[PDB]
Amino acid sequence: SHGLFKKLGIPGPTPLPFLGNILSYHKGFCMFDMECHKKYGKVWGFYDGQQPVLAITDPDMIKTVLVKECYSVFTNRRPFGPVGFMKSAISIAEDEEWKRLRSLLSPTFTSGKLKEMVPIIAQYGDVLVRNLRREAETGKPVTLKDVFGAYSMDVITSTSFGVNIDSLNNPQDPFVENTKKLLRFDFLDPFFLSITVFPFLIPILEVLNICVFPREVTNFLRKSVKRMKESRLEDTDFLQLMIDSQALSDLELVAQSIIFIFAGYETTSSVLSFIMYELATHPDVQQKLQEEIDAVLPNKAPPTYDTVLQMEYLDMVVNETLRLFPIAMRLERVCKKDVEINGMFIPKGVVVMIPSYALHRDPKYWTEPEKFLPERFSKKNKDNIDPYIYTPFGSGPRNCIGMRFALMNMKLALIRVLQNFSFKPCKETQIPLKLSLGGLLQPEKPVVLKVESRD
Ligand code: HEM
Ligand SMILES: CC(C)c1nc(CN(C)C(=O)N[C@H](C(=O)NCCCCNC(=O)OCc2cncs2)C(C)C)cs1
Ligand SMILES: CC(C)c1nc(CN(C)C(=O)N[C@H](C(=O)NCCCCNC(=O)OCc2cncs2)C(C)C)cs1
Numbered sequence: 026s027h028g029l030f031k032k033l034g035i036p037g038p039t040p041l042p043f044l045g046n047i048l049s050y051h052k053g054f055c056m057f058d059m060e061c062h063k064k065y066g067k068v069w070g071f072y073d074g075q076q077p078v079l080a081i082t083d084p085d086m087i088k089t090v091l092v093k094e095c096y097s098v099f100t101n102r103r104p105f106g107p108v109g110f111m112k113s114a115i116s117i118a119e120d121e122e123w124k125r126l127r128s129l130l131s132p133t134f135t136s137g138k139l140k141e142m143v144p145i146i147a148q149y150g151d152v153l154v155r156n157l158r159r160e161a162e163t164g165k166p167v168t169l170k171d172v173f174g175a176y177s178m179d180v181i182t183s184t185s186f187g188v189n190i191d192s193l194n195n196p197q198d199p200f201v202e203n204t205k206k207l208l209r210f211d212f213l214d215p216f217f218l219s220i221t222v223f224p225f226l227i228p229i230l231e232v233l234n235i236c237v238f239p240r241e242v243t244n245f246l247r248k249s250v251k252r253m254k255e256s257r258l259e260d261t262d263f264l265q266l267m268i269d270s271q272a273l274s275d276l277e278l279v280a281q282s283i284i285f286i287f288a289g290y291e292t293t294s295s296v297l298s299f300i301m302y303e304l305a306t307h308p309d310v311q312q313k314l315q316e317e318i319d320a321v322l323p324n325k326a327p328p329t330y331d332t333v334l335q336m337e338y339l340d341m342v343v344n345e346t347l348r349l350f351p352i353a354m355r356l357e358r359v360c361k362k363d364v365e366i367n368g369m370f371i372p373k374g375v376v377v378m379i380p381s382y383a384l385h386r387d388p389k390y391w392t393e394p395e396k397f398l399p400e401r402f403s404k405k406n407k408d409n410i411d412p413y414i415y416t417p418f419g420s421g422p423r424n425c426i427g428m429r430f431a432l433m434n435m436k437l438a439l440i441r442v443l444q445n446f447s448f449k450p451c452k453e454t455q456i457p458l459k460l461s462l463g464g465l466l467q468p469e470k471p472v473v474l475k476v477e478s479r480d
Pocket of ligand 1 (some may be wrong): 416420421430
């Protein structure tokens with residue numbers, strides 16, 4: 026397989042037998058991708074074991090992959106390891122199985138439903154605020170990821186079966202304790218390295234029932250969803266709309282819910298911590314934002330759907346943080362069949378990969394790409410921004426279905442958090458921040474910050 030890119034005249038790093046290029050992942054996905062763009066230009070190919078991956082950076086070609094020929098060629102992603110029943114999770118499903126689940130779960134994130142969560146997730150804003158105060162008179166650096174973690178868990182749980190939890194103040198609630206494994210899902214463990222060199226071993230793991238998703242969790246939710254289906258509401262949000270529309274197996278319902286529990290927890294939490302790092306290392310941006318909030322919501326007023334979209338600088342700050350720290354790092358699609366996009370021929374079976382992280386830090390689009398500058402995203406400057414270079418939620422029919430929910434939910438956290446506190450660096454604060462060793466962006470060391478109340 027290692028002769029494909031030579032034969033197609035596409036440049037790239039020299040593959041070793043069996044391994045392909047995987048040894049290059051030792052400097053991390055981010056450095057590997059940056060270095061490849063730098064020295065190969067617009068397009069290159071590499072091997073994840075025997076799997077050919079073709080990197081693209083042309084905004085049109087990108088638009089052809091993600092938008093135009095999605096349904097007909099570039100419809101699916103590549104799974105990593107034994108996935109078991111999670112074969113039917115929206116995120117992992119393929120072709121018609123996927124299209125059905127997407128159409129089915131479309132209506133979850135309508136602006137109507139979005140409006141209906143504001144008041145629910147408000148309740149957990151207050152809980153967050155309280156937890157943040159008690160942690161601040163500690164006078165000792167605060168692990169935000171922990172505090173934010175608790176918040177975003179609580180929010181999405183309620184967005185399914187209003188199963189209310191204090192998280193922090195309930196480390197034992199069956200729903201909290203048991204879902205603890207579903208992240209830390211170790212995206213960094215060598216098993217994913219091995220399984221890429223030995224993808225031929227996956228069907229052996231499937232047959233033995235070994236699954237990358239902990240058995241403990243799958244088992245909790247199958248019975249949880251059983252109960253909240255019958256027991257909890259047999260008299261007369263996401264979960265409901267799953268049952269209400271019943272061909273959707275209960276096993277496939279758990280599939281979606283696990284995707285949602287994970288995504289709703291890690292994304293929100295990790296992004297909010299990158300954002301507060303950036304506000305703490307830029308006090309002026311922090312105050313400027315604190316002023317916008319106080320102007321739009323006078324006297325610590327409660328945020329509403331309409332006021333949240335009203336906050337331009339807030340949007341600017343969130344957008345810019347996601348430019349520097351797009352947690353997905355790469356976008357990927359499997360080429361279903363032979364094609365010629367924008368001139369170049371892609372053969373069946375290649376994974377076409379868009380290196381988001383590199384693109385978000387590419388000099389040809391970004392002045393001082395390394396610096397946190399929200400001005401970049403002001404209404405008179407955002408014209409200069411290509412929606413196929415900046416893509417923190419992907420693009421096209423298979424983009425982040427949770428985009429508007431995430432944004433919304435992150436802002437509601439910020440607005441409540443900045444209404445009451447200010448955030449400042451200290452000793453245990455890592456400056457400059459160092460990124461996760463691998464494929465899902467996380468901080469190297471947990472983000473720790475000083476928190477002062479505003480009276
Ligand atoms: C700010 C945090 C988040 C970021 C940066 C983010 C980013 C992404 C990106 C880049 C993709 C890939 C799309 C593509 O390939 O073009 C994606 C897929 C997806 N995301 Fe989001 N996401 C976030 C939060 C969420 C939330 C809150 C949910 C839902 C509760 C969610 C559910 C999904 C699902 C289900 C997919 C697979 C989509 C499909 O195959 O139909 N993510 N996420
Ligand atoms: C539920 C959560 C813990 C997840 N675990 C995984 C890991 N597993 C088991 C996979 O097979 N993942 C596969 C995977 O990691 N793809 C290869 C790298 C893709 C790089 N881009 C990338 O990560 O895009 C973000 C997303 C894509 N889909 C959902 S989020 C895909 C099916 C997402 C994906 S989402
Ligand atoms: C783990 C590390 C040792 C290595 N993995 C590899 C294999 N490669 C190239 C991979 O792409 N690996 C995979 C990978 O890093 N995938 C990227 C993360 C995908 C998981 N989820 C994810 O992307 O979440 C963001 C979301 C947005 N909306 C909902 S979730 C696997 C670790 C799942 C080489 S070295």
